[PDB]
Amino acid sequence: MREIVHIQAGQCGNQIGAKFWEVISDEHGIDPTGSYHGDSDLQLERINVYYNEAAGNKYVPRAILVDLEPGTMDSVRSGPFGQIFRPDNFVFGQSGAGNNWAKGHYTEGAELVDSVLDVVRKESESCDCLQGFQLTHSLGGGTGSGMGTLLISKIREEYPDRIMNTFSVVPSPKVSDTVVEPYNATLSVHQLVENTDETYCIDNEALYDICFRTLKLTTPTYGDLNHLVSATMSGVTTCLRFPGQLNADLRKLAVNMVPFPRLHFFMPGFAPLTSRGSQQYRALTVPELTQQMFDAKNMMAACDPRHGRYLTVAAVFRGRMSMKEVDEQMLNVQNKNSSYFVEWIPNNVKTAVCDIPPRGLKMSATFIGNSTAIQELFKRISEQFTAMFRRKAFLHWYTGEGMDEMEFTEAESNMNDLVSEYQQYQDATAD
Amino acid sequence: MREIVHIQAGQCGNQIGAKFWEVISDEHGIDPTGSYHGDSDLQLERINVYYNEAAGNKYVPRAILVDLEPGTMDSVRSGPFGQIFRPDNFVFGQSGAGNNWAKGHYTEGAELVDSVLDVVRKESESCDCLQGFQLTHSLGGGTGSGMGTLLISKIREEYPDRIMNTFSVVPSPKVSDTVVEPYNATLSVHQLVENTDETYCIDNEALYDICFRTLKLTTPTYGDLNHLVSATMSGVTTCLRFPGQLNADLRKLAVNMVPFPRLHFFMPGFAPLTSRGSQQYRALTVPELTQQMFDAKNMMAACDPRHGRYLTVAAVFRGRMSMKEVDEQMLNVQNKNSSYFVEWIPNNVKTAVCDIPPRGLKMSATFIGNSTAIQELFKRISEQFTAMFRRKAFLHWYTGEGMDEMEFTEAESNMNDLVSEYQQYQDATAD
Amino acid sequence: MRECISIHVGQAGVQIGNACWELYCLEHGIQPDGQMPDSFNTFFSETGAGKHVPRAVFVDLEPTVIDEVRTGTYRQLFHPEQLITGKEDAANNYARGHYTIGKEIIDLVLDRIRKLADQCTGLQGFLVFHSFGGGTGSGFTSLLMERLSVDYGKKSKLEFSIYPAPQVSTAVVEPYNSILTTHTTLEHSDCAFMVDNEAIYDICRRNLDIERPTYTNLNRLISQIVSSITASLRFDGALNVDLTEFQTNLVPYPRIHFPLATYAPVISAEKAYHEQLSVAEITNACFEPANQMVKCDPRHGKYMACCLLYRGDVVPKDVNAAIATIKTKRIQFVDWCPTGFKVGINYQPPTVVPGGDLAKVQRAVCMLSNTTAIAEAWARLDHKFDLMYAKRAFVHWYVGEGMEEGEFSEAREDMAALEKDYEEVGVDSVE
Amino acid sequence: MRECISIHVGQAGVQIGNACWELYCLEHGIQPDGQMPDSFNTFFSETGAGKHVPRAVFVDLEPTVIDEVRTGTYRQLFHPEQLITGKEDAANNYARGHYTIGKEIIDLVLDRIRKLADQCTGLQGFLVFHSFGGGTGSGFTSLLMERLSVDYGKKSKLEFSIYPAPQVSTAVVEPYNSILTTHTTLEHSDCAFMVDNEAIYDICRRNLDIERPTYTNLNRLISQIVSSITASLRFDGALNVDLTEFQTNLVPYPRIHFPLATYAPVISAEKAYHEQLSVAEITNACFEPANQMVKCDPRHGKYMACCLLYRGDVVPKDVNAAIATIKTKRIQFVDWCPTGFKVGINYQPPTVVPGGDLAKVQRAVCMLSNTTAIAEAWARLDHKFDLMYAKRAFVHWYVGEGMEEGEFSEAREDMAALEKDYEEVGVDSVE
Ligand SMILES: CC[C@H](/C=C(/C)[C@@H]1C[C@@H](OC)C[C@H](O)C(C)(C)[C@@]2(O)O[C@@H](C[C@@H](OC)[C@H](O)C(=O)O1)C[C@@H](OC)[C@H]2O)CO
Ligand SMILES: CC[C@H](/C=C(/C)[C@@H]1C[C@@H](OC)C[C@H](O)C(C)(C)[C@@]2(O)O[C@@H](C[C@@H](OC)[C@H](O)C(=O)O1)C[C@@H](OC)[C@H]2O)CO
Ligand SMILES: Nc1nc2c(ncn2[C@@H]2O[C@H](COP(=O)(O)OP(=O)(O)OP(=O)(O)O)[C@@H](O)[C@H]2O)c(=O)[nH]1
Ligand SMILES: Nc1nc2c(ncn2[C@@H]2O[C@H](COP(=O)(O)OP(=O)(O)OP(=O)(O)O)[C@@H](O)[C@H]2O)c(=O)[nH]1
Ligand SMILES: Nc1nc2c(ncn2[C@@H]2O[C@H](COP(=O)(O)OP(=O)(O)O)[C@@H](O)[C@H]2O)c(=O)[nH]1
Ligand SMILES: Nc1nc2c(ncn2[C@@H]2O[C@H](COP(=O)(O)OP(=O)(O)O)[C@@H](O)[C@H]2O)c(=O)[nH]1
Ligand SMILES: [Mg+2]
Ligand SMILES: [Mg+2]
């Protein structure tokens, strides 16, 4: 079998991860004590992908939780599934870093990481075929970005041939919930780009819109938001955990989604998301699903794909459905809206099918889009970045941590070039 | 199969539609929950014409309800069949437009429509063969006319080859229930003419007369009035929903009813309308029905066909009857009263027969007349229009919405020419 | 073996077909399930299980009609692919039937036909059923014939058609569609058989002594005629007449090929008991204007050729005697003809359909008649056309479907010539 | 005895194999436990207890697929070592399949094969199943063939392959992998059989008259084809055809060896009851473009060679007659050929798999066809390649696995030549 290491970093990362593991355990019949009470042999058969059968019937999700300070991971341990985790996988310091990327990637993180990695190594040692790593982190967070970035680099150093992917939480185009976002985010990306093999962009902003609209919710609690995200994450690796018709290994996804290194940012989506108040007025067909999947309004990343083109799209389906329906339906999309796809690439769609549906959803699908419209995000960031940077805003909170100002200019350089790259391909033509 | 999209617009439109759907659901054995409890396989077999089998046994009438403000559609949702509709098909704003056509077709409607159409598109996407569109709206209404007109234009833009028909409520020759009728109505017609393929004219005034007289009613409640109208509407599409001897597709009706584009206004009728107090003194024969159908007093449009000629008449029968009876009887009408028919056209009658009677009426028929006498209506309107317009009455409530005064003069121009056209054909002769 | 392919087009064509095949089964003892609990290989093929499969193709752009068949009693008698349906009908628009809609179906139809034809050991010809005026019947058939004549230039092309009776209704745009079809029909059809619904009603009233007839028994009468013709192939007779011989014995000049038809002795059992239906009696009845299936008083013109088909208990010599008497009856014949009578005799008497309204007889006569009197009908038609065309009523419906306005002129021109042809024939050629 | 070794590579290869062996067992009465409660020694070996063990090797770097087999119904039919699995798949990367991953498995595979081959008394050849585009199928097979041809330079090397259908999806990097494989395949394979999933869907829709098909029955159709071929070895026939003879009778020029395939008569029981599937009937069906298993309208090119395999109730003379007719059908053949028909006849009629969607017939025809029309498909493929290669999309995924960039150029070059070859063949050689 192939194994995945799940690393969680930062308050956000840990909170998301907590929900993630809840979801995964649920799907495999694992209760809060780590005891197996599933119904299908499949649940157990390939459980190895995530859990390490410790002893008896106790399974221990191979996850590592990291934070610079307590009060977060603590709450995780106090929660429903706190006891499912092995204590020794909780690695944290006793200092904060109020969204101080420098601290997270230097003066504080440099100490903490000395541990962390040791645990990582141990976990990788227990694996038979290390599929890769998953990092749940939030951009802009002193830990999430600081440590996140650091760890990524350090891991590739020792596992250059493994697939690394992360589910980053990006900056919001609307109200920012931090002050020094631009800086932290930019600094992270500066290195992220040159490391992680693929990364997903999820924006709370977009998620709120979905909730208030599509889900008809009025109290979009972070727990609910995380739940939604978790669902997406689980979909991504369903192909590893369960049998299907067209299994798509994590690596495979990278191959059909990244055309050029560096250009590996994705917009995630998910269907169906019908509110309970209207579920009875649905059909739940392959067409219905694709309607949602390609609906700009269901993009979990706060960008409007309508203004860009897709370099490539992956569609992973779960449950039951015909091959005919899927393929034909996906074709129709490309044909009807050909202007939204990059002419350089014939067949801009990768599909996959697993025979195991989400609990309660006979049909479900995830959407991974590599749209050039993501450029927009980076553009926004760069603009905000230079606005602050040229005024030297708050730079003393980075300089004071031993950060060289030049690092910022380098970071910008990478960022701007990223934008340029997308812009070039955006309108580059075959002839 | 072929599918029809039912759009309802304005308070009136929605109230009528509510009754309409009640009627239709009844005929197909659909209860208020959308569950099928019919007796004949026919009821279900071709249910697709209107309902979209959502899931299980729940059918969802493919209708779209539109209004500029709540308090109307709300009451619909609070009614008997409110739950039969899919919530997502209720599109409305939060602003009124006190019979302000300009608002409905500009400053307010221009915002609302951006949504609406999206829903329309979705509904059309779910269809296999989009027969066309039906719009239930009221002339003179800020929404009904304003949005109505707008939507019609917008739809043709994307569905130029579909049949669009509406069931407009026209101005009354007697007491007007609005102040700025002439304006709103004229402005609507100005565009209506150049869009909608066929439209029906129903006048509350006439309906009241029928009720007090023929139906021997004393409390003609709008619900009852709407019921009557609904019956007519259902008759029109019975040929699509049910088998018969001479099925007449919606398109077919247009073909045999419109001799020249623009000239597509019709006077609807219905038989039998015998009051319960005297139903036992009836025969219910094909002759009886035609007596009612060609009785000027049973015209649902407030015009007196006696003063004009028929360009063409469609007669749709439901239930059981012989072909012999029908054809011969219709012939007799043309022969006996040949002066009332336009000599240009041999055989001024189109007939159709469906084998499925209305609930409780073994024999029933609808009447669609293209009479030149409709000219009268337009004449009245134009006269009233210029009376107000020349005094600049209330124009500031349109000018203030960004309406160009020239639009009124153009509207009049179209109106007057419409009248002229009818007048020409009215007395134009073969030699 | 002598084989024949029937083609049923449009509401009428199909619905008539229903009656026909119902009858065919009865006569050959074939049960609805294709079972026969030695003259079948003309209209029926044998499957692996021995099951009989009638040889016909049903085409109707209006799936409703065929659905009735698909769900009807004889749904087991058709190979699914013999029932070809469209999604939208021709709305009484020749142009739709010919140019824009039928165009997209005809390919399928012909392919199916070809495959059917390829099962034959010796195809005699085709029997096409349609109605003038029907967008499908009229329009589509035009197209069909155009292409059938290419592949099968030497096969007999017989057709039966409902000729818009002088004083009936149903559709308004009839004379347009009618002429448009005729214009092309003349160049491909070998012989058309005209039938008026109007005339039939009269017969039902006076001969059957019934009232209130529908297509459910009007068609039954028609099917008797059809049977009478094909009985020649299906049963041994004293004088069998192959389909090919109908050209020779009816047409005397290419462009003229519209025989009228009749059928004696129509009669209710009530009168049957009181009347001796002798050969002579029946023969005389066939020439009584009242009994023609076409509203055309034969006395207005002269006969060009008659063909008599006797079934059942007849005696050659008696037949001859009867005919001689007919010749004596100073009934006029053109000088171009010296004989005028070709007679077939089939031993198989007429049958009777359970629940029918026609008494069973020991002998019957079907007569086909080519007469100049029909010119009247053509004139009437042309006249109606002229009136509508002058103002260009409904023309935009055809032009909008790609029809050329000049095409109407063309058709009319040819029709004028046709009428003239009849005039010339009846000139009474003399030195 | 004539023996044959089957090899199943990758998701498709294996999953198809499942269907195949399922079928083989059925036809020979072999029960899932290898039990037979005299033509088996071709695909099956006898163990000490008499138990049957099919002769095939399953290879898939993605253990998931094989695990399904290992835990499936037929888990008792395989000698553990016949099920060879890897730890990580090729991620749609030819380079992984060929150079970096497959490299480490191939040794095992070949050894196993050798041992299997050593059980044979006379190996006819191999049947390799794979898909173009599949990293394993495409990449690994390339490697496999490269080495099989060394040890067994004189054995027949047949393969079946899924040819990335013109308008479908599944993977993005297809055309890369496809061409890369083709480039090497041409130098080792004796004859490849092209199958399109796309085409099959069409067949399911139109012939089977079904909807929503999956690989669970798409493969079943394919297995019928495979059976038809090997039936020659497995059962006595009037004209048995050894595998070797397929080279001679299909290939006329080394580099060209991509026959298309079809299979008649696909059909649902519904229609079976209404249709006589004669020899001639079926034979004709095989040449109807619609029924090809490859999206390539054969009329675009000419035929080079056809091979017909009849099963069941057929009569040599009838077969000959049918073919003669086909020759008459002015279906074009290259001047280089004067015959073009090699025919096999096997007495063993087709069978039917319980729970399948295909009606059982008394006779069937499998056709293999070498045609120049396929050049079109090759052109399409090459074109797609060019577009992606130009920008070097996804190239880094191959280069990172040790592939030489120039290697792509090389492959493309050869493909150009291949296309050219077809052009030259269809030149219509004339003095
Ligand atoms: C294909 C990828 C994709 C890009 C486009 C343009 C796609 C195309 C189609 O979906 C596949 C639209 C679709 O067919 C519909 C019309 C039914 C519909 O869904 O369109 C949207 C608006 C549309 O954007 C205008 C949407 O937001 C969107 O994203 O559309 C309103 C919605 O109200 C119910 C409904 O009317 C991005 O992932
Ligand atoms: C034919 C189309 C038609 C036009 C005419 C003129 C038609 C002709 C006939 O109906 C078909 C009249 C009819 O045969 C009657 C005499 C039995 C009768 O019904 O006539 C009306 C008055 C008449 O107008 C005078 C009516 O209103 C009307 O519309 O009549 C009183 C009524 O009291 C019971 C009764 O006496 C318009 O659709
Ligand atoms: N005798 C007879 N006449 C019929 C029947 N059905 C329709 N007609 C006549 O046929 C003519 C109308 O043509 P239809 O066949 O109904 O039209 P269609 O071919 O279906 O064409 P569209 O409906 O226009 O697509 C009228 O003259 C009708 O009276 C029938 O069952 N029997
Ligand atoms: N007909 C058919 N086609 C299949 C099946 N499975 C996969 N395919 C097709 O095969 C192609 C994909 O190759 P796969 O065989 O799935 O890939 P693989 O060989 O497992 O290689 P990797 O997964 O890349 O290691 C696509 O064109 C699929 O549509 C199957 O069971 N039947
Ligand atoms: N979706 C989501 N976002 C979160 C959550 N908790 C914090 N955030 C977001 O993460 C960012 C703040 O970073 P955080 O992880 O708390 O800081 P850190 O501990 O220094 O990494 C902000 O954009 C928050 O909106 C969560 O549970 N879910
Ligand atoms: N027949 C009928 N007419 C109505 C109904 N409700 C309103 N009306 C008429 O519609 C016109 C007023 O327009 P309304 O639809 O209420 O205004 P809107 O909401 O701005 O479109 C008047 O002529 C009313 O008599 C109804 O339920 N039935
Ligand atoms: Mg019709
Ligand atoms: Mg695989």
Q: What CA–CA distances, in Å, run from B248 to B23, B62, B397, C89?
A: 21, 22, 44, 9
Q: Name the residue type at position D73.
A: T
Work out whether the CA dihedral C387, C392, C396, C401 comes out positive or negative: positive
Per the CB < 8 Å rule, is C48 touching D276?
A: yes
Q: Do A356 and A390 lie in a common domain?
A: no
C-alpha C89/C-alpha B247 separation (Å) is 10
Whether residue C82 contacts residue C112, with contact meaning beta carbons closer than 8 Å, is answered with yes
Closest-CA distance, B55 to chain A, in angstroms, reads: 5
Contact partners for chain C, using 3 or more CB pairs closer than 8 A, are B, D
Please, which residues have CB within 8 angstroms of residue D334's CB and are 6 or more apart in sequence? Answer: D302, D303, D304, D372, D425, D426, D428, D429
Backbone angles phi, psi at B72, to 5 degrees: -125, -65
Q: Which two tokens stand for residue C212?
A: 């209130």
Q: Is B144 annotated as a binding residue?
A: yes
Using an 8 Å CB-CB cutoff, list chain C residues near B256.
92, 171-173, 394
Residue B40 marked in a binding site: no
Neighbours of C208 (CB within 10 A): 20
Which residue, among A224, A317, A208, A315, has the nearest Cα to A267 in the 3D structure? A315
Residue B163, φ and ψ in degrees, nearest 5 = -85, 120
Q: Which residues of A343-367 are buried (b: 16+ CB within 10 A; e: fewer)?
A: ebbbbbbbbbbbbbbbeeeebbbbb
Nearest CA to ligand 4 atom 30: D12
Task: Pick the closest to residue A202 from A179, A238, A231 (CA basis).
Answer: A231
Nearest to C160 by CA among C124, C187, C143, C185: C185
Return the structure tokens found at B174. Answer: 């007697």
CATH, residue A401? 1.10.287.600
CB contact at 8 A, C144 and C109 = yes
Is-contact D332 D338, C-beta < 8 A?
A: no
Residue B11, phi then psi, degrees to nearest 5: -55, -50
- In the PDB record, what is the listed experimental method? cryo-EM
Q: Are residues B24 and B160 in the same domain?
A: yes
B351/C65 CB distance under 8 A: no
Instruction: List phi, psi (to 5°) of B271.
Output: -145, 155
Residue nearest to atom 13 of ligand 5 (CA): A141
Shared domain check, A266 and A250: no
Question: Taking the domain D1-259, which CATH number applies?
Answer: 3.40.50.1440
Domain of A95, CATH number, reads 3.40.50.1440
B58 vs A280, A284, A291: nearest CB: A280
The domains of chain D are located at 1-259, 260-373, 374-431
Kindly name the residue from D146, D245, D376, D407 that is annotated as catalytic.
D245
- Chain CA centroid to CA B387, Å: 28
Please check whether residues A276 and A234 belong to one and the same domain. no
Nearest CB neighbour to C46, from listed D209, D276, D362: D276
From D178, D88, D180, D184, select the one nearest D144 (Cα to Cα).
Answer: D184
The closest of D29, D32, D4, D6 to D17, measured between CA atoms, is D6
Nearest alpha-carbon partner for D88 in A121, A240, A152: A240
The CA distance from D96 to A156, in Å, is 20
Spatial separation of the C-alpha atoms in residues A182 and A186, rounded to whole Å:
6
Query: For residue C44, which of C119, C114, C112 has the smallest C-alpha distance?
Result: C119
Q: Which two tokens stand for residue C17?
A: 């077909």
Determine, for residues D274 and C53 on separate chains, whether the beta-carbon distance falls below 8 Å.
yes
Contact state of A282 with B55 under an 8 Å Cβ cutoff? yes
What does the alpha-carbon distance between residue C374 and residue C104 come to, in Å, rounded to a whole number?
35
Contacting chains of B (3 CB pairs or more, <8 Å) are: A, C
**What type of residue is C167?**
Q
Q: Are residues A309 and A417 in the same domain?
A: no
Q: How far is the CA of A296 from the centre of ligand 1 (A)?
A: 7
Q: At what angle do helices C375-391 and C405-425 cross, to 10 degrees?
A: 160
Report the separation in Å between the CA atom of B127 and the middle of ligand 3, taken as the mean of its atom positions.
28
Is the separation of the CB atoms in A341 and A298 below 8 Å? Answer: no
Instruction: Check pocket membership of B340 for ligand 2, CB cut-off 6 A.
Output: yes
Looking at the structure of chain A, the number of domains it has is 3
**How far apart (Å, rounded) are the C-alpha atoms in residues D175 and D192?**
18
- Give me the residues paired with residue A267 across strands: A369
| Rounded CA separation A337/B398 (Å) | 40
Query: Touching check for A258 and chain D: CB below 8 Å?
Result: yes
Contact B104, B111 (CB under 8 A): no
Helices (H), A193-322: 204-212, 222-236, 238-241, 250-257, 286-293
How far, in Å, from the CA of A172 to the mean position of ligand 5?
Answer: 12
Q: What are phi and psi of D277, to 5 degrees?
A: -85, 75
Q: Are residues B317 and B246 in the same domain?
A: no
- What Å distances lie between residue B318 and A33, B247, B249, B351, CA to CA? 69, 11, 14, 11
Minimal C-alpha gap between A166 and chain D (Å): 19
The verdict on A284 touching D (C-beta cutoff 8 Å) is no
Bridge partners of A313?
A349, A369
> In terms of domains, do A304 and A379 share one?
no
Within D165-267, strands assigned E span 191-195, 260-264
Which residue CA neighbors atom 5 of ligand 5 most closely? A12
Q: Which atom of ligand 1 is nearest to the CA of A367?
A: 38
**DSSP code for A259:** S
Are B101 and B145 in contact by the 8 Å Cβ rule? The answer is: yes
Residues A367 and A396 in one domain: no
Nearest CA-CA partner of C133 in C165, C103, C107:
C165
Residues forming a β-bridge with A271: A365
A405 annotated ligand-binding residue: no
User: Which one is catalytic: C46, C68, C88, C245?
Assistant: C245
**Are residues A28 and A80 both part of a single domain?**
yes
Please enumerate in sequence order all residues whose Cβ is within 8 A of that of B97, keeping only pairs 6 or more positions apart, or say none. Answer: B68, B103, B104, B108, B109, B142, B143, B146
Q: What is the resolution of this structure in A?
A: 3.5
C-alpha separations of C292 from A202, B378, C228, C329 in Å:
82, 50, 16, 18
Instruction: Identify the residue whose tokens are 């990481």.
Output: A113
Q: Is D138 on the interface with A (CB under 8 A)?
A: no
Cα dist. D147→A366, D10, D106, D152 in Å?
41, 18, 9, 9
Residues 2-21 of D with CB under 8 A from A: 11
Same domain, residue pair B81 and B127 = yes
The answer on A153 and A17 residing in a single domain is yes
Domain boundary among A206, A224, A259: A259
Identify the closest residue of chain C to B346 by CA–CA distance: C384
Q: Which residues span the domain enclosing B366?
A: 260-373
Q: What is the least distance, in Å, from the CA of D337 to any CA of chain A?
A: 37
Take atom 25 of ligand 5 and give the residue whose Cα is closest: A177
Rounded Cα gap, residues A328 and B129, in angstroms = 19
Q: Which amino acid is at D207?
A: N
For residue A284, give the chain B residue with the closest CA. Answer: B55
User: Phi then psi for D145, rounded to 5 degrees?
Assistant: -60, -40
What lies within 8 Å, CB to CB, of A172 at 6+ separation is A203, A204, A205, A302
Cis peptide before A268 (omega within 30 of 0): no
Q: Which atom of ligand 2 is nearest to the CA of B305?
A: 37
Distance C343 CA to ligand 7 centre (A): 37
Strand ranges (DSSP E) for C251-323?
260-264, 303-312
D397: number of Cβ within 10 Å: 24
Question: Which CATH architecture does the domain made up of C260-373 adopt?
Answer: 2-Layer Sandwich (3.30)
**Could you please report the per-residue DSSP string of D365-431?**
EEEEEEEGGGHHHHHHHHHHHHHHHHHTTTTHHHHTTT--HHHHHHHHHHHHHHHHHHHHHTT----
Is any atom of ligand 5 closer than 6 Å to the C-beta of A226? yes
**Residue A148, both tokens:** 């996140």
CA distance A220 to A226: 10
Does A198 lie in the same domain as A264? no
Q: Tell me the C-alpha to C-alpha distance, in Å, between residue C11 and each of C89, C162, D270.
A: 10, 11, 26
Cβ of D276 and C49 within 8 Å?
no
D374-431 is a CATH 3.40.50.150 domain: no
Task: Return the ligand number nearest the Cα of B269.
Answer: 2
In terms of C-beta density within 10 A (0-12 exposed, 13-18 middle, 19 or more buried), how is residue C212 classed? middle
Q: Give yes or no for B370 touching C (CB within 8 A).
A: no
- Cα distances from B27 to residues B50, C319, D374, in angstroms, run 12, 58, 56
Task: Kindly give the distance from the C-alpha atom of residue B248 to the centroid of ligand 7, in angstroms, as a whole number.
Answer: 8
User: Touch between chain A and chain C (3+ CB pairs, < 8 Å)?
Assistant: no
Asked if residues B241 and B3 have their Cβ atoms less than 8 Å apart, the reply is no
Q: Which of A236, A259, A282 is the last residue of a domain?
A: A259
Helix (H) or strand (E) holding B120: helix B109-125
Helical segments of A369-405, H only = 375-389, 396-399
- Strand ranges, E, within C358-425: 363-371
**Ligand 4 pocket mutation, candidates D7, D20, D131, criterion most atoms within 8 A of CB:** D131
Q: Is A144 in the pocket of ligand 5 (CB under 6 A)?
A: yes
Q: Is D419 a catalytic residue?
A: no
Cα torsion through C211, C213, C218, C219, rounded to 10? -150
Please, what is the angle between helix C197-206 and helix B323-336, to 10°?
110
Please tell me the distance in Å from A85's CA to the nearest CA on chain D.
27
Domain final residue pick, B259, B274, B297 = B259
Identify whether the C-beta of residue D91 lies closer than 8 Å to the C-beta of residue D173.
Answer: no
By the 8 A CB rule, do C261 and C366 touch? yes
Task: State phi, psi for A202 to the nearest 5 degrees.
Answer: -125, 135
Amino acid at A399: T
Q: Chain A residues with CB inside 8 Å of B53's CB?
A: 283
Q: How many CB atoms lie within 10 A of CB B224?
A: 15
